[PDB]
Amino acid sequence: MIPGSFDYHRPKSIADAVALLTKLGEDARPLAGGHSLIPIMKTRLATPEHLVDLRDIGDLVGIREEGTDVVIGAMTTQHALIGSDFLAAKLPIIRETSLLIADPQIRYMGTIGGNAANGDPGNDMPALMQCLGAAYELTGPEGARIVAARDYYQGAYFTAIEPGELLTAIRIPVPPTGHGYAYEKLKRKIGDYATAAAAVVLTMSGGKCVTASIGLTNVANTPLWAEEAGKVLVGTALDKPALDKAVALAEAITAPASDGRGPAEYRTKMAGVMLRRAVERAKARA
Amino acid sequence: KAHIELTINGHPVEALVEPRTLLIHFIREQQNLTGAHIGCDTSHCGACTVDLDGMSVKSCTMFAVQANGASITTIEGMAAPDGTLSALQEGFRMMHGLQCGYCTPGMIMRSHRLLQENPSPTEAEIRFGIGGNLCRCTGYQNIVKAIQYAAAKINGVP
Amino acid sequence: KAHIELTINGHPVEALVEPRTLLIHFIREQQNLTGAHIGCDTSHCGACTVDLDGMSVKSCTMFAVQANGASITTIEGMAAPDGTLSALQEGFRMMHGLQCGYCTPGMIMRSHRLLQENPSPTEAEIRFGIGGNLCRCTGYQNIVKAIQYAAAKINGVPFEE
Amino acid sequence: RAEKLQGMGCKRKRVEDIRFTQGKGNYVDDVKLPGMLFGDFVRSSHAHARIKSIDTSKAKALPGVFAVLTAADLKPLNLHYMPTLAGDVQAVLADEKVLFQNQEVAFVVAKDRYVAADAIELVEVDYEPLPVLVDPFKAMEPDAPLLREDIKDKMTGAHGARKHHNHIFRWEIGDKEGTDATFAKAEVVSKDMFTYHRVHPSPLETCQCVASMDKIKGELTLWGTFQAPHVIRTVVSLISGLPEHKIHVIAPDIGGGFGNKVGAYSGYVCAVVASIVLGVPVKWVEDRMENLSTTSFARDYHMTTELAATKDGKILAMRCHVLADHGAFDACADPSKWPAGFMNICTGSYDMPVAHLAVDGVYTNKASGGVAYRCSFRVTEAVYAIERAIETLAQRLEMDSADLRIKNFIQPEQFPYMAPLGWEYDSGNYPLAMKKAMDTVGYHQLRAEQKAKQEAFKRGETREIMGIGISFFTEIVGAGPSKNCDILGVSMFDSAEIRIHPTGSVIARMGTKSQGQGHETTYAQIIATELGIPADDIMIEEGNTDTAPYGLGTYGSRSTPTAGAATAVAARKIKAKAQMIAAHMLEVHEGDLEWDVDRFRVKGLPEKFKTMKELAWASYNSPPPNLEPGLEAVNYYDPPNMTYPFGAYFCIMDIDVDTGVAKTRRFYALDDCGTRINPMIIEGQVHGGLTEAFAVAMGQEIRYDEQGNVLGASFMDFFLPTAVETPKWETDYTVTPSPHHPIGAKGVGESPHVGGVPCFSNAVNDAYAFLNAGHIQMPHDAWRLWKVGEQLGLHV
Amino acid sequence: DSAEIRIHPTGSVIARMGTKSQGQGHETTYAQIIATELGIPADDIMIEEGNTDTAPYGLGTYGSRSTPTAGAATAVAARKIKAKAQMIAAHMLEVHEGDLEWDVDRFRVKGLPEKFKTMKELAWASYNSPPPNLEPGLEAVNYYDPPNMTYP
Amino acid sequence: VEPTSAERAEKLQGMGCKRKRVEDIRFTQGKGNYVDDVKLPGMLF
Numbered sequence A: 001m002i003p004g005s006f007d008y009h010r011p012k013s014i015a016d017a018v019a020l021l022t023k024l025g026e027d028a029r030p031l032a033g034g035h036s037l038i039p040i041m042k043t044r045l046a047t048p049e050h051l052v053d054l055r056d057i058g059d060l061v062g063i064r065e066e067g068t069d070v071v072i073g074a075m076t077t078q079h080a081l082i083g084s085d086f087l088a089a090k091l092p093i094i095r096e097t098s099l100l101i102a103d104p105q106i107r108y109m110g111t112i113g114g115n116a117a118n119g120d121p122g123n124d125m126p127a128l129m130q131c132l133g134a135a136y137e138l139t140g141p142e143g144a145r146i147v148a149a150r151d152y153y154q155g156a157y158f159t160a161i162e163p164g165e166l167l168t169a170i171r172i173p174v175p176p177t178g179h180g181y182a183y184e185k186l187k188r189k190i191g192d193y194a195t196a197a198a199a200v201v202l203t204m205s206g207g208k209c210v211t212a213s214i215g216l217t218n219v220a221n222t223p224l225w226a227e228e229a230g231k232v233l234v235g236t237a238l239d240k241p242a243l244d245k246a247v248a249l250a251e252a253i254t255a256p257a258s259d260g261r262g263p264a265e266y267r268t269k270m271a272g273v274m275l276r277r278a279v280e281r282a283k284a285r286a
Numbered sequence B: 001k002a003h004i005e006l007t008i009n010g011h012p013v014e015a016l017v018e019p020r021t022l023l024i025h026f027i028r029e030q031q032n033l034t035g036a037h038i039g040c041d042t043s044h045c046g047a048c049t050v051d052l053d054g055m056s057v058k059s060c061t062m063f064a065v066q067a068n069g070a071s072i073t074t075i076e077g078m079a080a081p082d083g084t085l086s087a088l089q090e091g092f093r094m095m096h097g098l099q100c101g102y103c104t105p106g107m108i109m110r111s112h113r114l115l116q117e118n119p120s121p122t123e124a125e126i127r128f129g130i131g132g133n134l135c136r137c138t139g140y141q142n143i144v145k146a147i148q149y150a151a152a153k154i155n156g157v158p
Numbered sequence C: 001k002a003h004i005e006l007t008i009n010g011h012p013v014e015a016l017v018e019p020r021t022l023l024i025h026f027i028r029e030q031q032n033l034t035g036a037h038i039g040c041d042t043s044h045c046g047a048c049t050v051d052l053d054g055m056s057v058k059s060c061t062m063f064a065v066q067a068n069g070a071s072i073t074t075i076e077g078m079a080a081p082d083g084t085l086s087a088l089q090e091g092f093r094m095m096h097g098l099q100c101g102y103c104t105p106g107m108i109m110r111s112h113r114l115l116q117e118n119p120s121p122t123e124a125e126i127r128f129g130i131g132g133n134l135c136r137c138t139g140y141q142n143i144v145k146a147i148q149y150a151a152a153k154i155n156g157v158p159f160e161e
Numbered sequence D: 001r002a003e004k005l006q007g008m009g010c011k012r013k014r015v016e017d018i019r020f021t022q023g024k025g026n027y028v029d030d031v032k033l034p035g036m037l038f039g040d041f042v043r044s045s046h047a048h049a050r051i052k053s054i055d056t057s058k059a060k061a062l063p064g065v066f067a068v069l070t071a072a073d074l075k076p077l078n079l080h081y082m083p084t085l086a087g088d089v090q091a092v093l094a095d096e097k098v099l100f101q102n103q104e105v106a107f108v109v110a111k112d113r114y115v116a117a118d119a120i121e122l123v124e125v126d127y128e129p130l131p132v133l134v135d136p137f138k139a140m141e142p143d144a145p146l147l148r149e150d151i152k153d154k155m156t157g158a159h160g161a162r163k164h165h166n167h168i169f170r171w172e173i174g175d176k177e178g179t180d181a182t183f184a185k186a187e188v189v190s191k192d193m194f195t196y197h198r199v200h201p202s203p204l205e206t207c208q209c210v211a212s213m214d215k216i217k218g219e220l221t222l223w224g225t226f227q228a229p230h231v232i233r234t235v236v237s238l239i240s241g242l243p244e245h246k247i248h249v250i251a252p253d254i255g256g257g258f259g260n261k262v263g264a265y266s267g268y269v270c271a272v273v274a275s276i277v278l279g280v281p282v283k284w285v286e287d288r289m290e291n292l293s294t295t296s297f298a299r300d301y302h303m304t305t306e307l308a309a310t311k312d313g314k315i316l317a318m319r320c321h322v323l324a325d326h327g328a329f330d331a332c333a334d335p336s337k338w339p340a341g342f343m344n345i346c347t348g349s350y351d352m353p354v355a356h357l358a359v360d361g362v363y364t365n366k367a368s369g370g371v372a373y374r375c376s377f378r379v380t381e382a383v384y385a386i387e388r389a390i391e392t393l394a395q396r397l398e399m400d401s402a403d404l405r406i407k408n409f410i411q412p413e414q415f416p417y418m419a420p421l422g423w424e425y426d427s428g429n430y431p432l433a434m435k436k437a438m439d440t441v442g443y444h445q446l447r448a449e450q451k452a453k454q455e456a457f458k459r460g461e462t463r464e465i466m467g468i469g470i471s472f473f474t475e476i477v478g479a480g481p482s483k484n485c486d487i488l489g490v491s492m493f494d495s496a497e498i499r500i501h502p503t504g505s506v507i508a509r510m511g512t513k514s515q516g517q518g519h520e521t522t523y524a525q526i527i528a529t530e531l532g533i534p535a536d537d538i539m540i541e542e543g544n545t546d547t548a549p550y551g552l553g554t555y556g557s558r559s560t561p562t563a564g565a566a567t568a569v570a571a572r573k574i575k576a577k578a579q580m581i582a583a584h585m586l587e588v589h590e591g592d593l594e595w596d597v598d599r600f601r602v603k604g605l606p607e608k609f610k611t612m613k614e615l616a617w618a619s620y621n622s623p624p625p626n627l628e629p630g631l632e633a634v635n636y637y638d639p640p641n642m643t644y645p646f647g648a649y650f651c652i653m654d655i656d657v658d659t660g661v662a663k664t665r666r667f668y669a670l671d672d673c674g675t676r677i678n679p680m681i682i683e684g685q686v687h688g689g690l691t692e693a694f695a696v697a698m699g700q701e702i703r704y705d706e707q708g709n710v711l712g713a714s715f716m717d718f719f720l721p722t723a724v725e726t727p728k729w730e731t732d733y734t735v736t737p738s739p740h741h742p743i744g745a746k747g748v749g750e751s752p753h754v755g756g757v758p759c760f761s762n763a764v765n766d767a768y769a770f771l772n773a774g775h776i777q778m779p780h781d782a783w784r785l786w787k788v789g790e791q792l793g794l795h796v
Numbered sequence E: 001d002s003a004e005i006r007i008h009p010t011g012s013v014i015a016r017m018g019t020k021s022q023g024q025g026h027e028t029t030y031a032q033i034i035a036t037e038l039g040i041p042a043d044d045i046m047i048e049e050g051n052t053d054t055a056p057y058g059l060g061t062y063g064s065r066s067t068p069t070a071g072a073a074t075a076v077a078a079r080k081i082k083a084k085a086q087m088i089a090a091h092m093l094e095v096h097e098g099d100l101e102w103d104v105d106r107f108r109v110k111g112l113p114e115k116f117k118t119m120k121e122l123a124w125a126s127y128n129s130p131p132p133n134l135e136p137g138l139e140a141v142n143y144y145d146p147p148n149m150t151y152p
Numbered sequence F: 001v002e003p004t005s006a007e008r009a010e011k012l013q014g015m016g017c018k019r020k021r022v023e024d025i026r027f028t029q030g031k032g033n034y035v036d037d038v039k040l041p042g043m044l045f
């Protein structure tokens, strides 16, 4: 329950936050909504010497369309995502997913950026972002760079971010109008990280799938982008043979933990079931 | 220690806090507002819920320094200045929405915000809307009734 | 408010007080040492007596600011750390030197100083020596005995009977 | 004045709610006393190890730390172990070894809980691992580790002059010879091993106390989460040497107990010792992870359960043997003579000629407990055993299990019914309740619907299966008669004291202690009806051992059986004295008076009367010369028997065999607890208990791995349903009064859990019965029900 | 005036009265009355007055009334406890109550002094093994209406 | 110790004894609780 002592900072700008993180070093952590970091500080798994609260940086909050992308500031809360009718018009999968994250209190505080940057495979947004082919905008002392969400995750609490960098925004290509989408999550109760979950976006024409992308949540030490599984759907009617192929190729890449949510073998199968169900719902939406 | 200034239940508060002090401890220990409760060490139970800048917040998952400049309502702030119970407080009593009372402050504080988010919620909306709040005693059924009763009362005021 | 630093019952104390705050009220209301009592408004009763820089003082007739830098002992400071009561505290109980207890803190604090002034006082010296302390309950006779008991205890030998 | 009475049977709104809805409850952690410190424990990272050294120097040196106690500090006060309710001892601070993960090793006392937590991290313990024992089935093997070195020598088998060193007790009851003979010849023998898995009561408020030794006065005040505060006083007295009149135990508002707060914990002892040493108050408040992993677990019974029957479905005998995992110390709350509680109610609602029960308790490297979480002293286990055995027998007989129950119920005319393991049931009308329940849920129609759904499944038309869960149960609550029920030698009575003021209001106190069950509301309803005094004119208090009459506390649904009875009896003493006052005032014989709601009237001259209010005043103003002034009474009520409420619960469950996800379609709960004091409160008790039942059956668990690590002991994993997962509850009742109880009222609070768990588990088991799954062990969460289907070939 | 006396399982006592000391020593002296009546040392008895929620109703301390009224009540309440204790003793010792004699702090069987129960033992027995005809526990109240004043 | 009747009586410190006062422990140490010693949250004068 009780964290170790730390110093607390409120930088006024991205630049000042990056400068602070760079100066203070590895013992400094960004503080966004706090709803993953504070819990692990309370267990003393995390014992940072400094927290750099991003609360006063307005430029980290917001949702805009820029070109062919939606750009979401890292500090945009789950509650804000859900509330954005503009985002629901363009990227309705985000609201659907966010409503499957945590609980109202947590969603008031938790941010998209903190969900994406956290590195716990339990988080839902990572695999959604991989599904959507989002790019993460990172700013550090050496400047800005972009890392694809598909390339961002290496392991539990191991991501591509470098010392002194903040994830400042997530840039999400907007799927075509009329696209199908679904996020299907299996969990033990409200608030629980997925036993398995699947994010799907697809498009159809003339009864055939034209595009499909699939992400899988919490069925490996990272989110997974199920590249082969999505490709096998393309050119099919999204019928049983096609779904069975996609399920196979998705299951093949899983490597789940055996924990209170069940053993790895179950969770692999549940990735497949969630995938099937998500494809079905996406097909119907398409 | 950091100096903070905020408002709690409409009153100015100024204090010196260690950054690591959790908001729930600040409220209970330093401010002596012991209505808010601690029911867990993992952020699940919602017994520590307060209304903070228009949000339902689990105050065990926030440091007091993060609440600098905030406006917080705790359960002590729900009754009217003349002592009259809020619609929610009254509904929880009328509908037998509490037993031990331990979740109740958090439940009411969450519900206060719920009914601002959605003044006329369905039962599914209520149950989902309080999903961050655990109760051991009631089995939730009368809590739903309590919230519905409060909505009806609120909706009849204007 | 005035800043004061002093010592009470052997412990450092630092405080802010209004000049007009009576020492009795600082001790009772700010320091929560509620053994000392107020029995009067004219400085007669002695119920507020504390030991202050080697003097018996009626703390209702002193402002807290006047005690800046002082060393004060109140009744709470009389018992030993090990729990044992002082000779006076014991004598008061043994000789039935108190009833309601309201004068007792000030009687004992006065007596503490009396027995430093005069370790082996006669009865007349005792009575005179506590003349600034009123008691409503005891009629003083047992207080005298209590002080005699304490003196004899301290001295290792009795004096008067 | 009719509107004001709010007596028995009224849905009186709760007086407690005023404060609780406003945050003005007074729970232990709300207490702040001058100079109060905070203490908490350094806890064992090992399940089984010798303690080689404990270095507390860095912790003591930390600013703000006032003490660090180890067993070395307690031993001289004979407080390194504490007695348990079960007649064992439990280590307060670990001395030579630790025996369960998270066991208390040192107690750090600091300025506040933040500094205490810092200091705990500075204590260094060196351990020498010992072999871990977690599987109770192996606890009595010849090579099982010697856990309890403090009380046991090595004893590796079962034929030595002491039991196996890991064997706590063997308890048996019933007619072995007769039972064995019936099983040897019965046409059908139905045997299964049902495990009731370890769970935890997990009250929302954890265990905690504030100890304040006043060294000047030599008096200890102890605020705490105590379901049985008078018991705690007496125990604190026996172990501390302070006399009871100088120990002031205060159980204030308690944020739920659910059995977790009956016994004493190391934290209470250590806070007390620390306060005594330091002379200032010491608060101890545990966090959830420590609550779940170090305080009273529940269940953990492995029940080999057999029914003997004729092919036509008459039950001839029951034979049950239980292996009980008690963890490292036997701290299992129970009346002292009942080491397996009332597990001998396991013949249930059925009239069986003979039965036999044996229970062996064993030590393992786990937290202690057993009795908690609405078990009524192992009645959860008893009921699960029989209600599951009914279902497995019915499968074996190819009989509908409703019909099997009907064929075997104890009939109303048989009460009071002496059951074959010794309990005499007070009253019951089982056939009527069962019928009401079946009719309400449309039972036979459900079965036809189920059959059609099964056929559909086989035709590949649905991936969902339907189960119909039945639980018809007989509870036993109200411990209990002095002849056989005592808590560490104190007979299990309870008590009430009622005092009427001159102006007619009342203060009444009881020896129980609510943790949310509404006693402050409902005890006043009993009095209100008895005396004609409005309930709002009556103040109810519990929990201050200086003021409340001695009682045995609240657990085992005993409050209404014991203190509810005492309340009525005490009120009737007052009424009798009032009648004498009225006779004096009206100048008639007492026999010439009759009670009429709120007054005594002269028979045949109804215009001449005296009201209770008038009599109260008279008792002070014009006391009759033959009588003492005033108007008050006490009763300590030694019950003549337990009360035996019952219920008929039906669950319809739909299960997705591909994910294992079960969804309750409907849950109907009929409870009969005799006279119903407050229907609103009873309903809430049922809702709460059914939600626990759902949780236990469908997800909750505390587990240990082979290394003795405690698993799942946080709300990350411990299944507590939210409003989203919790089913809607349909409740119903019948009323079959307890003949021996002063107001005919039986206990009820535990009934929903007792009956509910088998109802849910039976529904799950029933869903898969057509697929021949056998007995599916709880909990019935998704991965485990997926495994059931996987193993049945349903996924290919 | 009034007295309520409750004996705990382990033999200590809480007793309250309807008077209120202002220094007359009631907390000491009422316990003396009880001690002699019950054979329980005075130091084992806690006396309280003045909290109207807890103390039995009384008319207070003035008119030198406390000993005449609550002192009477204390003795009478204590005698009620003694009478119950004697019943418990007779049950435990398997004799008639008339076969018992009191010896400071215990009932002994007349002619057989080695057969006895102390008040402390009886207090525990009242909780541990209540005779079937009696309520558990060991306590009493008396509200004492004096027949006359006392005339020192 | 099998105390005599007289020893047992003496230990009682009952009727007729010059029993020393229990109140004196707190009063001699300033730990009485008189009205003006009471302090409650928010108390006015």
Ligand SMILES: Cc1cc2nc3c(=O)[nH]c(=O)nc-3n(C[C@H](O)[C@H](O)[C@H](O)COP(=O)(O)OP(=O)(O)OC[C@H]3O[C@@H](n4cnc5c(N)ncnc54)[C@H](O)[C@@H]3O)c2cc1C
Pocket (backbone or CB within 6 Å): A029, A030, A031, A032, A033, A034, A035, A036, A037, A038, A039, A074, A075, A100, A101, A102, A103, A106, A109, A110, A111, A112, A113, A114, A115, A117, A118, A122, A123, A124, A125, A161, A165, A166, A167, A168, A191, A192, A193, A194, B042, B043, B044
């Ligand atoms: C009880 C409970 C249930 C939950 N259930 C779910 C769930 O179902 N699904 C789910 O997805 N989440 C769940 N969460 C986690 C929640 O969504 C967190 O909000 C999220 O994981 C972290 O976002 P945050 O804004 O709170 O970040 P923080 O906790 O503030 O930070 C998390 C991490 O990311 C870093 N960080 C944050 N922002 C940045 C940034 N802009 N740049 C670089 N690093 C950054 C921090 O330094 C820290 O290392 C749950 C949490 C709780 C308490």
Ligand SMILES: Nc1ccn([C@@H]2O[C@H](COP(=O)(O)OP(=O)(O)OC[C@H]3Oc4nc5nc(N)nc(O)c5nc4C(S)=C3S)[C@@H](O)[C@H]2O)c(=O)n1
Pocket (backbone or CB within 6 Å): B099, B100, B137, D256, D257, D258, D259, D372, D373, D374, D375, D515, D516, D517, D518, D519, D522, D523, D554, D555, D556, D557, D558, D559, D560, D561, D673, D674, D675, D676, D677, D678, D679, D681, D682, D685, D688, D745, D746, D747, D748, D749, D750
């Ligand atoms: N015939 C009856 C029986 C009961 N009641 C009312 O129902 C309540 C519960 O009474 P009873 O069945 O006698 O149970 P207890 O009060 O002894 O409660 C103990 C029981 O209470 C249960 N319910 C709980 N509910 C809450 N809120 N908190 C707990 O800790 C609880 N713990 C569980 C556990 S475990 C147990 S053992 C009381 O207000 C009683 O008046 C009634 O109106 N009529």
Ligand code: FES
Pocket (backbone or CB within 6 Å): B037, B038, B039, B040, B041, B042, B043, B044, B045, B046, B047, B048, B049, B058, B059, B060, B061
């Ligand atoms: S105390 Fe449980 S969520 Fe805050």
Ligand code: FES
Pocket (backbone or CB within 6 Å): B097, B098, B099, B100, B101, B102, B103, B104, B134, B135, B136, B137, B138, D204, D255, D256, D516
């Ligand atoms: S009322 Fe007890 S936890 Fe909700």
Ligand code: FES
Pocket (backbone or CB within 6 Å): C037, C038, C039, C040, C041, C042, C043, C044, C045, C046, C047, C048, C049, C058, C059, C060, C061
């Ligand atoms: S109060 Fe009387 S002299 Fe001070």
Ligand code: FES
Pocket (backbone or CB within 6 Å): C097, C098, C099, C100, C101, C102, C103, C104, C134, C135, C136, C137, C138, E023
């Ligand atoms: S003891 Fe009462 S005034 Fe002296």
